[PDB]
Structure 1
Amino acid sequence: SLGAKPFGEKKFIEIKGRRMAYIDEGTGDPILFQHGNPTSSYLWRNIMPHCAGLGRLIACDLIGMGDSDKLDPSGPERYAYAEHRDYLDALWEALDLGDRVVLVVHDWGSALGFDWARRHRERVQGIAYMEAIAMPIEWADFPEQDRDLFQAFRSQAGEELVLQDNVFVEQVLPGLILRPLSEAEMAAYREPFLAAGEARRPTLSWPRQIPIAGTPADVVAIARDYAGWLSESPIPKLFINAEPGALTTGRMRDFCRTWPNQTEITVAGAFFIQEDSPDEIGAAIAAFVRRLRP
C-alpha cells in the first residue's frame, strides 16, 4: 500500500568518523535496498514490507543524505562518487552481510551497487535494478526536453539552482512522479536538505557525476567496468522497467536487455517509480527472492 510512514526507525553506525543511518529489519540473508539522488532509505518504505520474512531487509542512507551525517566542511569537491563509495563500502562491511546478498538498486544506488557487486561478486546472490546507470552515456540519451536542465546542473548555474533554490528536492523529484506527493512525503524528502547552502551539495554533486560524453573520466571508467562485467555475469538479475518512464530515450534499456540470466518486468511510473507502483515493485522483488531462496 501507499503511505507516508517510514518502514522502520533508524539505527546508526559510525563510519570513518561520521554517523551513518540505516534501516535493518528481520533475520536471514540480506536484501539491500539502495536509494539514489535526491532520495534516502525513505524511498523504499512501501516496498520493503512485501519482502517481510524473506530475509534481512536493509536500507542505508548515503553519506550527506537522509539521516546520515553531512561531510563538513563541504564545497565543490565534496560528495563525489568515489567518496560516497568509500563510506558505503565501509558501512556494508560493518553490517556483516554474509555471502548471499540480494541487491535492490536505483539511480545512483545502482552505480554504487553495481560496482560493489563487481568487486564482491563472490557474495552476490541476485541483483534487482531500476533507473539504472548501466553504462556511460551521451547527451543524446536524454530526451531533448531534459537536456537544458541537466546541462545547467553541470554548469555554474547549478549552484544557485541547488544550493539556493533546492530544485532537485522541490521540483525534479515531484516532477518525475505521476502521483502528487503529500505534504508529509515532501517533508520527509526535504528534511535532510532544509538548510540553504552545502547541506544540499549531495543533490548537486550527483548530476555532476553522471558519466556523459566521457566526463567525469573516473566515473566513466567505473561504469565501463561494471557494464562489461554485468553483460557477461551469470548472477540472476531482475530488470524493473517503467512505463512511460523518464529521462532516457532507450539506448541504455536496450543494453540492459542483453544482460544474462535476467527477468524483466514492467511497472507504471516515470522516474521515481517507487512512489507510483510500490506494490508492483515489491511483489516483483519478493517473487524474485523467493525463486533464489526456495
Structure 2
Amino acid sequence: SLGAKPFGEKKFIEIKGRRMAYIDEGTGDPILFQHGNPTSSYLWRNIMPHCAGLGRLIACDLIGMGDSDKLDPSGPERYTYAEHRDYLDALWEALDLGDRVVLVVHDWGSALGFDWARRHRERVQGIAYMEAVTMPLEWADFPEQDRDLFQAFRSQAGEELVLQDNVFVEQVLPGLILRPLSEAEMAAYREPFLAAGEARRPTLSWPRQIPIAGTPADVVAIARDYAGWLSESPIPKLFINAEPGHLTTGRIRDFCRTWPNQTEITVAGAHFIQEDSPDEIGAAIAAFVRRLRP
C-alpha cells in the first residue's frame, strides 16, 4: 500500500570517521535498495515490504543524505560521485553482504550500483533498475522540460537555487511525482535539508555530476564502463519502465532495452516512480527475486 511510515528501524555504523544510516531487516542473501538524489532509504518504504521473507532487506542512506552524517567541511568540491562511492563501497563492505546480492536501484543509486556491480560481478545475483542513468548522456537525451533548470544547477546560479532555496527537494521532487504527497511524506524528504547552506550540498553536487556531453569526464568514463559491461553481462536483470517516465525514455531506454537476460514491466510514474506505483514495483521485484532464489 501507500503510507508515510518508514520501513523498519534506522541503524548506524561508523564509516571513514562519519556515521552512516541504513535499514537492515531479516536474514539471508541481501536485497539491496539504493536511492539517489534528493531522496533517502525512505523512498523504498512501501516497496521493501513486498520482499519480506525473501532475504535480507537493506536500504542505505548516502553520505550527507537521510540520517547519514554530513561531510565536514562541506563545499563546492564535496559530494562528488567519487566521494559518494568511497563511502558507499566502505558501507557495503562493512555490512558483510556475501556473494549473492540482488541490487535494486534508482537515479544516482543506479550509477553507484551499476558501477559497484561491474567491480564485483561475481557477487551480483541480479539487478533491478528504474529511472536510471543507463549510459553517458547528450543534452538531446535529457528531458526537454528540465534542460534549463539542470543547466542552471550546473552554473553559478546553482548555489542560490539549491543551497538557499532547496529547489531540488521542494520543486524537482514533487514535480516528478504524479500523485500529491502528504505533509508527512514531504516532511520526511525535507528533514535532512531543513537548514539552508551546506546541509543541502549533496542535492546540488549531484546534478553537477550527471555525465552530460562529456562532462564531468570522470563520471562519463564510469558510465561508459558500466554501459558497455551491462550490455554484455548475462546477470539477470529487471527493468522497471515507467509511463510517461522521465529519464529512462528515448535513446537511454532504447539502449538499456538491449541488455541481455532482462525482464521488463511498465508502471505508472514520472521520475520518482516509487511514490506512484510502489505495489506494482514491489510485486515485480518480489517475483524477480523468487525466480532468482527458487
Question: Does the TM-score normalized on the shorter chain lie above 0.5?
Answer: yes
Using the TM superposition, give the Cα deviation of residue 141 of structure 1 relative to its aligned residue in structure 2, in angstroms: 1.0
Using the TM superposition, give the Cα deviation of residue 146 of structure 1 relative to its aligned residue in structure 2, in angstroms: 1.5
Task: Indicate conservation of the 8 Å contact 2:101/2:126, yes or no.
Answer: yes
Residue 101, structure 1, aligned to residue 101, structure 2: yes
Using the TM superposition, give the Cα deviation of residue 9 of structure 1 relative to its aligned residue in structure 2, in angstroms: 1.3
Q: Secondary structure at the match of 1:127?
A: strand
Residue 223, structure 1, aligned to residue 223, structure 2: yes
Query: TM-score scaled by structure 2?
Result: 0.99
Ranges of 4+ aligned residues in structure 1 off by more than 3 Å? none
**How far apart, CA to CA, are the structure 2 residues paired with 1:146 and 1:132?**
16
Using the TM superposition, give the Cα deviation of residue 126 of structure 1 relative to its aligned residue in structure 2, in angstroms: 0.1
**How far apart, CA to CA, are the structure 2 residues paired with 1:249 and 1:110?**
15
Task: Indicate conservation of the 8 Å contact 1:142/1:248, yes or no.
Answer: no
Task: Indicate conservation of the 8 Å contact 1:143/1:248, yes or no.
Answer: no
Using the TM superposition, give the Cα deviation of residue 249 of structure 1 relative to its aligned residue in structure 2, in angstroms: 4.9
**How far apart, CA to CA, are the structure 1 residues paired with 2:42 and 2:248?**
24
Q: Secondary structure at the match of 2:171?
A: helix
Task: Indicate conservation of the 8 Å contact 2:30/2:100, yes or no.
Answer: yes
**Cα separation, partners in 2 of 1:248 and 1:155, compared to 1, 3 Å:** farther
**How far apart, CA to CA, are the structure 1 residues paired with 2:132 and 2:10?**
26
Q: Which runs of 5+ in 1 are unaligned?
A: none
**How far apart, CA to CA, are the structure 1 residues paired with 2:162 and 2:8?**
29
What's the CA shift string for 1:70-108, capped at 9, x where partnerless? 001000000000000000000000000000000000000
What's the CA shift string for 1:187-224, capped at 9, x where partnerless? 00000000000000000000000000000000000000
**How far apart, CA to CA, are the structure 1 residues paired with 2:196 and 2:31?**
34
Task: Indicate conservation of the 8 Å contact 2:130/2:248, yes or no.
Answer: no
Q: Secondary structure at the match of 1:232?
A: coil
**How far apart, CA to CA, are the structure 1 residues paired with 2:273 and 2:249?**
17
What's the CA shift string for 1:163-183, capped at 9, x where partnerless? 000000001000100111100
**How far apart, CA to CA, are the structure 1 residues paired with 2:43 and 2:106?**
10
Task: Indicate conservation of the 8 Å contact 2:241/2:248, yes or no.
Answer: no
What's the CA shift string for 1:96-152, capped at 9, x where partnerless? 000000000000000000000000000000000001111101111123222100100
Task: Indicate conservation of the 8 Å contact 2:21/2:61, yes or no.
Answer: yes
**How far apart, CA to CA, are the structure 1 residues paired with 2:225 and 2:144?**
28
Equivalenced residue count is: 294
**How far apart, CA to CA, are the structure 2 residues paired with 1:142 and 1:85?**
24
Q: Secondary structure at the match of 1:181?
A: coil
What's the CA shift string for 1:226-245, capped at 9, x where partnerless? 10000000000000000011
**How far apart, CA to CA, are the structure 1 residues paired with 2:143 and 2:235?**
31
Query: TM-score scaled by structure 1?
Result: 0.99
**How far apart, CA to CA, are the structure 2 residues paired with 1:108 and 1:133?**
7
Task: Indicate conservation of the 8 Å contact 1:141/1:248, yes or no.
Answer: no
Q: Secondary structure at the match of 2:265?
A: strand
Using the TM superposition, give the Cα deviation of residue 8 of structure 1 relative to its aligned residue in structure 2, in angstroms: 1.0
**CA-atom RMSD, angstroms?**
0.7
Task: Indicate conservation of the 8 Å contact 2:239/2:263, yes or no.
Answer: yes
Task: Indicate conservation of the 8 Å contact 2:238/2:288, yes or no.
Answer: yes
**How far apart, CA to CA, are the structure 1 residues paired with 2:143 and 2:260?**
28
Identical positions, percent: 98
Q: Which runs of 5+ in 2 are unaligned?
A: none
Q: Secondary structure at the match of 2:7?
A: coil
**How far apart, CA to CA, are the structure 1 residues paired with 2:249 and 2:61?**
29
Using the TM superposition, give the Cα deviation of residue 246 of structure 1 relative to its aligned residue in structure 2, in angstroms: 1.7
Task: Indicate conservation of the 8 Å contact 2:30/2:58, yes or no.
Answer: yes
Using the TM superposition, give the Cα deviation of residue 248 of structure 1 relative to its aligned residue in structure 2, in angstroms: 5.6
**How far apart, CA to CA, are the structure 1 residues paired with 2:197 and 2:258?**
42
